[PDB]
Design a protein around this ligand. Structure first.
Ligand SMILES: [Cl-]
Ligand SMILES: [Cl-]
Ligand SMILES: [Zn+2]
Ligand SMILES: [Zn+2]
Ligand SMILES: [Zn+2]
Ligand SMILES: [Zn+2]
Ligand SMILES: [Zn+2]
Ligand SMILES: [Zn+2]
Lengths: 312, 311, 313, 311
C-alpha cells in the first residue's frame, strides 16, 4: 500500500548533524519551491512570475530565522535581514531561472547557494563575496514534467522529487555521481560567429571525431537548470564560455555558476572558467559574470586540453 | 494574484519563542498530510489505523524531539532510542473515528504534547501527567477540508491544509467558543443506560422550562467532528459516566485531555462532572474518563443538574 | 503498478445504452462537482452564501453548456430556468447545489443533490415540466464532499458509487450495484424537535432506545446535512427521518431536489422512502419548492415505522 | 473569486457542431491526465512508462465507442476495435514521445491524429494509410512544467491547460497563429557529418547572416513535442531532414509528422519533406518514416530556396 517511513528532505537534512538553522532554512525554501511549482503549473489559467517567485523566496528565507544576507538575481543590492529574524547563513539565489521562455513549457528552476557568515563584523553585501569553495550547501529546484530538488552538501549530491499528493520532497536518488565521460554536448551554437577558436575546435571534434569514434549528440534547452540537470543525469558537457565580446561570459557567478559548479564537483564532475575552477574565483561584485564549462570530468578535461593549446 | 508572505503552521510555531517544538509539529504535519491523502483515496486503494499509527510513530521518532510516545494503538509506551531522542512526551490517537470511515464521515488525528518533567531516564511514567501540564495539544480533522487546530498557552489557532502547496495556512487566529450555544451532542441511543442527571439535562434541552427555544441535536459519532463543531458553533458535547461505565468510554491521555486543553484555551469548559478533565492525575496510559465539554454556560447548566443528583 | 483500464463514471454511463445526451449531461455535472469539491477543500484560505451562489452558478452554467437540458430547477432560484434554444436538450434537472452549506464552517460533509427527468410534454419547455412524480426519474443521485469526494448515481439498473481520484480528476467506480442492508442498527433524526413530534415518531424512537424484545438498543447519528445522513444510511443500513408534525404538516425537506433524488437512490438500492401515507416517488408535486415528509432507509426499519404510523390518525 | 463559466476542452469540441468526436477526445483527455500524473510521480513510483501510457491510450480509445482502427508507435500492427465498442474514427498515436530521456525531466508528450473511416468495407490497417490532408483533428499533450493539450481542427488551433485542482483542460489560447518569421533554429547539430549540403548551407546562413542581420539562436530539446511547441509559441524552424544515410528521414509519418504538420498548417505555418507538404504524402506502411522541416512560413521558405538549388 503506502509507505509508513517517509524519507523527506527535512529528515535527510536533520540526520546530517548543530543548532538546527540549516534545516529551518531548507524547510522555508521548500515552501517557496512548492508555491512556485504550483504557480508555474497553472501559469496560463492565472515578468509577473519572476517578481512573485522572488517575493516568495525572500519572504520565506527571512521568516526561517536562519539567514542574515540575501542576494538575488532580481535585486540590485543585497538584502540585510532585520536583527529580530536574523540567522547565520548567507543565501545567493536565482528565483526563476529560464522564465523568459516560460510560455513554451520549457523546464524553469530556482538555483540557490548557502554560505556560513565567515566575518567577525555586522552582516553586509561583502559577506556574499566569497568563493564558491566556501559553500555549505547549494542546488536547484527543477520545475519540469516532475518537480525535483537537487541538493549538494559536503557529503555529496541527493535528489528529491516533490510528491504532489502530500506536498513533500521525497529522496529518490542517493549520493549521485556523474558518468566519467558522456556523449552529449550542450551550448547555443547560434553564437558560433562570436566563438573563441578553442570552442570552435572543441565542437568540431565532437561532430567530426578524429579517432573514428561516434559523433556526440547535441542538446540545448536554453534553460540552465534543465541543461545542467540533463548533464548530471546522462553525462556529457555544458558550455557557456567567454569570447572576445564577453570576456567574462554571460552567466552570473554568485547565483547561477557557483551553485551549479558545487553540485558538479560534489557529483565527481568538473566546472571551469577555462583558466580556473569556477569555485576558486573570488568575486568583487554580487552581479559579476563568469564563463562556465561543466560536466563529465573526461569531457571537461578534453575541452581544457583544447583550451590550453589556444593559450600563450 | 498569489500570496507572497505565506503564513504557515511552521512560521507560527517559530514565532512563538532550541527549536524542538517546531521540528516536532513539522514532522506531525508530514504524517497528517499523508493520512489526509490516504483517506481521500481510501476506496480506490482497518489497515488505515495501522498505516496511520506507523506514519505518526515514524515521523515523531525522526523529528529528534520526542522521548516517550503513547498511542491508542499500542499497549505500552514507545521509548525513543537515545540517538533520536528529544525532550517531549507525545500522546496521540492516529485515526479517531476510523470504524465508520466507509460513510465518509470526518475522521481525525488527536495529539497531546508534554515537556519531560522528571529528572531520570525516559519511561511510560512520563506520560502519566495531568492534562494541566500540556505544552501543546490539538487535532487534525480530515473532513470536507483538512484542518489542524492547535492549542498552546497563547490560545487556539486553526490551520487549513492548502492542497496546491501541501502547507497548513493560518485561517483563524485566537479562536474563542461562544459563551452559550444552541446545540447538544451525545448518542441518545444509549438513553436506557443514562445517569438520571444526563436524562434530566437532555429533557431540559428538548422541553425548556423558561419558554426559550429547544436546542438542536447533532451527533456525528466521530469525536473530532463533534468537538470541532462545538468549538466553531458553540454548545455542548457529552460522553458521560453511567452505572455500566463509571469512568466513561473515551480515553483520558489521547482523546479527553487534548480536547479539554483546546476547549479551555478557547474560553470553554471540559469536566468529568466532579472535576476538570485537565486535573485528573492518570495512573494507566489507557484509562478512561467521562467528558462533558463546550460553551461555558452550557457546561455550567449541566453541572448544576449534576450537583442536584449528587451527595 | 497503475491501472490501465480506468473505469470512469463517463465509461459507465456510455455502456448503459440512445443519442448520448445523458453522458454529456452527467459529464458536465461532474465538471461542476470537481470545481465545487476544490472550492470546499480550500474554503477557509479563499472565502475569508458565497459558496451557495458559486456552486449554483457552476451547476447552472455547466448544465446549460451540456446541450442536454431544457429546464433547470434549483433550490437557490425562485423560478425554473429555461435553457436558451441554441443550447437546449431533452432533459429536466432538479438540483440542490450545496446542501448542508449553513454548517460548512465545521467541516461537516456538504453535497450536491440532483434529479433528472425526460421532458414528457408535447409543448414548449416550462416550469410545469419539473412538476413530475419521482417515479418518472431517469437518473438521480448526489455528490458528497467529505473526507473523500463521492458521487452516488442511481439509474434503472441500480446504484453505483464513484470516488473522485484527486490525482487525475476523474470519478472511479468503487462500488457496483449497491444494496442497503435489510435491517440496520442506527436511527437518524433531530431529537431536539421532540416537543413537536407526532406520537408515531415518539413511540417509534422509544422502541429504538428501549427495545421490547431484549435486543440491543439502536445507536443514534445525526449530522444535520441530508447527504451525509442518507449516505451513512445507504452504507451502514438503518433509518433516517424528517417527518411531518402539527407545525409542519408537509415536513421540512424539499420534494423536487432533496426528497425525490434520495428516495430514488433508496428504492434502487432495495430500500424504502415514505411520507408515511405513500411512497415519496408517488407524490405528484404542484409547486417546485413544495415540502414533503420523509422516512427512508432499510426496508425492515421503515416497515417497522409504518406499522406504528398505521396505528395513528 | 472563482470562474463560474468553466471553458473546457469538452465544451469547445461540443460547440464545434452524433457526438462521437467529443466522446473520443474526452476519453483521450482521461488517458492524458493519467499519463501526466504518472510522469509527475515517475521517480517515487518507479520502458515501463511507454507500456503503461500505450495501454492507457488504447483502453480509453476503445471504451469511447468512437474508434474502429488504432495505430500506435508501440504496436507492430493496427488494433481493430471489437464490434461492440466500434465507431467511425481511425486514430494514429504516439503515447509517450521523448520517453527515452524521461529521467532528465525533459518535457515528454502524447501525439495523436484522427481520421474518419473513408472505405465502405470491414475495418483494417489500410484505413490508417490516409494522407495527413484527410485529418479531422490532430494535436498533442505536452507534459512539461504545466500540462498542455494543443488541438487543431478545420477551424484552427486552440491550447488547453490542465487545471490540476479540478482535472479539466481549460481554454487558454484561442485561434493560435505562428509568427511569419522567427529567430530560432532547431535540429541535432551533432549529426552534421551526415547532413545534406542544403541543410549545412541553411544552418551556416543562420549563424553567419549575409545581410548584416542578427544570427539566430539555437534550441534543441531532443523531444519532438517540446521542440514543435516552442516553434509554435515563439516562431522559427524545426528540422529532422533526409540525408544519404536516412533517405526518408527518422520521424514516423502517421503518428509524429502528420499530426505536427496539421497543427503547423492550421496555425498558418508550414511543414515540408523538402519535395512536398508532409500532409500530401500517401503512406504505404503504418510505420514509414518521413523527413520534416516545419515552422514559421518565411523560415521554411528560406530553407526551401536552398533545398531547390540542390539534388
Ligand atoms: Cl562512468
Ligand atoms: Cl441484510
Ligand atoms: Zn538566472
Ligand atoms: Zn480515538
Ligand atoms: Zn438542500
Ligand atoms: Zn400511539
Ligand atoms: Zn515518437
Ligand atoms: Zn550547395
Amino acid at each position: 500500500p503506502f509507505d509508513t517511513d517517509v524519507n523527506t528532505l527535512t529528515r535527510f537534512v536533520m540526520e546530517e548533524g548543530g543548532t538546527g538553522e540549516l534545516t529551518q532554512l531548507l524547510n522555508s525554501l521548500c515552501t517557496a519551491v512548492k508555491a512556485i511549482s504550483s504557480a508555474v503549473r497553472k501559469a496560463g489559467i492565472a515578468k509577473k512570475l519572476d517578481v512573485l517567485s522572488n517575493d516568495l523566496v525572500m519572504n520565506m528565507l527571512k521568516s526561517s530565522f536562519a539567514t542574515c544576507v540575501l542576494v538575488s538575481e532580481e535585486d540590485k543590492h543585497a538584502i540585510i535581514v532585520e536583527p529580530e529574524k536574523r540567522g547565520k547563513y548567507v543565501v545567493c539565489f536565482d528565483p526563476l531561472d529560464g522564465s523568459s521562455n516560460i510560455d513554451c513549457l520549457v523546464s524553469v528552476g530556482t538555483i540557490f547557494g548557502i554560505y556560513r557568515k565567515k566575518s567577525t563584523d555586522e552582516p553586509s553585501e561583502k559577506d556574499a563575496l566569497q568563493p564558491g569553495r566556501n559553500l555549505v550547501a547549494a542546488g536547484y529546484a527543477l520545475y519540469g514534467s516532475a518537480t525535483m530538488l537537487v541538493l549538494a552538501m559536503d557529503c555529496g549530491v541527493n535528489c528529491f522529487m516533490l510528491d504532489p499528493a502530500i506536498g513533500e520532497f521525497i529522496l529518490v536518488d542517493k549520493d549521485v555521481k556523474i558518468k566519467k565521460k558522456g556523449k552529449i554536448y550542450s551550448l547555443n551554437e547560434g553564437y558560433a560567429r562570436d566563438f573563441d577558436p578553442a570552442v570552435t575546435e572543441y565542437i568540431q571534434r565532437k561532430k567530426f571525431p578524429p579517432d573514428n569514434s561516434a559523433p556526440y549528440g547535441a542538446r540545448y534547452v536554453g534553460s540552465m537548470v534543465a541543461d545542467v540537470h540533463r548533464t548530471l543525469v546522462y553525462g556529457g558537457i555544458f558550455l557557456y564560455p567567454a569570447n572576445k565580446k564577453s570576456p567574462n561570459g554571460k552567466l552570473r557567478l554568485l547565483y547561477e555558476c557557483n551553485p551549479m559548479a558545487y553540485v558538479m564537483e560534489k557529483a565527481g564532475g568538473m566546472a571551469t572558467t577555462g583558466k580556473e575552477a569556477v569555485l576558486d574565483v573570488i568575486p568583487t561584485d554580487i552581479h559579476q559574470r563568469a564563463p562556465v564549462i561543466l560536466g563529465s570530468p573526461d569531457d571537461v578535461l578534453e575541452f581544457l586540453k583544447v583550451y590550453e593549446k589556444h593559450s600563450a
